Amino acid sequence: SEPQRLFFAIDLPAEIREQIIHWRAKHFPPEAGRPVAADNLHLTLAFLGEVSAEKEKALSLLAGRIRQPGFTLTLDDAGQWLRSRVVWLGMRQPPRGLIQLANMLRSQAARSGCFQSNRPFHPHITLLRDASEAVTIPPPGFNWSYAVTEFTLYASSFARGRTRYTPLKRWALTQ
Ligand SMILES: NC(=O)c1ccc[n+]([C@@H]2O[C@H](COP(=O)([O-])OP(=O)(O)OC[C@H]3O[C@@H](n4cnc5c(N)ncnc54)[C@H](OP(=O)(O)O)[C@@H]3O)[C@@H](O)[C@H]2O)c1
Ligand SMILES: [Cl-]
Output the 3-class SS for 42-105.
EEEEEEEEEECHHHHHHHHHHHCCCCCECEEEECCEEEEECCCCEEEEECCCCCHHHHHHHHHH
- Check if 22 is active-site: no
Pocket test for ligand 1, best of 44, 84, 99 (most atoms within 8 A of CB): 44
Q: How was this structure determined?
A: X-ray
Please tell me if the CB atom of residue 157 comes closer than 6 angstroms to any atom of ligand 1.
yes
**Is 144 within 8 Å of 74 (Cβ atoms)?**
yes
Decide: helix, strand or coil at residue 41: coil
* Phi and psi, residue 106, nearest 5°: -65, -40
Identify whether the C-beta of residue 119 lies closer than 8 Å to the C-beta of residue 8. no
CA distance linking residue 91 with residue 168, whole number of Å: 27
Protein residue closest via CA to atom 5 of ligand 1? 158
DSSP label of 30:
G
Burial class, 132, CB count within 10 angstroms (exposed 0-12 / middle 13-18 / buried 19+): exposed
Sign of the dihedral defined by the CA atoms of residues 89, 109, 14, 28, in that order: positive
Q: Is the CB of 60 under 6 A from ligand 1?
A: no
Q: Ligand 1, from 41, 163, 166, 168: best to mutate by most atoms within 8 Å of Cβ? A: 163
- The DSSP secondary-structure symbol of 130 reads S
Please give the Cα distance from 53 to 49 (Å, whole number). Answer: 13
CA gap 107, 15 in Å, rounded: 32
Gyration radius of the chain over CA positions: 16
Give this entry's resolution in angstroms. 1.7
Coil, helix or strand at residue 156 = strand
Helix axes 53-63, 96-111, angle to 10 degrees: 140
Q: 72, 104 in Cβ contact below 8 A?
A: no
Which residues are within 5 Å of ligand 2 (an ion), measured at CB?
36-37, 40, 163
d(C-alpha 163, C-alpha 67), whole Å: 31
SS3 category, 34 = strand
Number of separate domains in the chain: 1
The residue whose C-alpha atom lies closest to atom 35 belonging to ligand 1 is 47
Residues facing residue 158 across a β-bridge? 163
Q: Containing domain of residue 71, as a range?
A: 1-175
- Integer angstrom CA distances of residue 66 from 85, 105, 162: 33, 9, 32
Give the dihedral of Cα atoms 65, 66, 69, 72; nearest 10 deg. Answer: -140
Q: What is the CATH number of the domain that holds 68?
A: 3.90.1140.10
Q: How many helices (H) and strands (E) in the chain?
A: 3, 10
> What Cα–Cα distance (Å) separates residue 7 from each residue in 14, 63, 78, 143, 168?
20, 12, 23, 27, 10
Going by C-alpha positions, the residue among 72, 82, 78, 71 that lies closest to residue 92 is 78
* Angle in degrees, CA 154, 155, 156, rounded to 5: 115
